């Protein structure tokens, strides 16, 4: 599967061959609650933790399944 991981210059999509292929799309506050915007980090894990005590953390294990609300394949 592929993974829209926000890591390099643009959204860098990487295919995780091993067992860990889960695409997480977690979010918290990165100036939105402050001034700019919310936090968005997309990666490829094996066990996406459910950190919903304040940060919106989603878990999807499918090719390019971790796209964010602000920017996405338009």
């Amino acid at each position: 599967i592929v993974c829209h991981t926000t890591a390099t210059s643009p959204i860098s999509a990487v295919t995780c061959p091993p067992g860990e292929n889960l695409c997480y799309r977690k979010m918290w506050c990165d100036a939105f609650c402050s001034s700019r915007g919310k936090v968005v980090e997309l990666g490829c894990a094996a066990t996406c933790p459910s950190k919903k005590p304040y940060e919106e953390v989603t878990c999807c294990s499918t090719d390019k399944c971790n796209p964010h609300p602000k920017q996405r394949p338009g």
């Binding site: 926000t6 890591a7 390099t8 990165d30 936090v39 968005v40 964010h68 920017q71």
Partner: peptide, 25 residues
């Protein structure tokens, strides 16, 4: 010129105002 790593800072809010993280020099 960019023989380093990859880091990103995406904030939900502005489709045209993403903050990236890459080594300049």
């Amino acid at each position: 010129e960019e023989r380093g790593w990859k880091h990103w800072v995406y904030y939900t809010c502005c489709p045209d105002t993403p903050y990236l993280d890459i080594t300049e020099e």
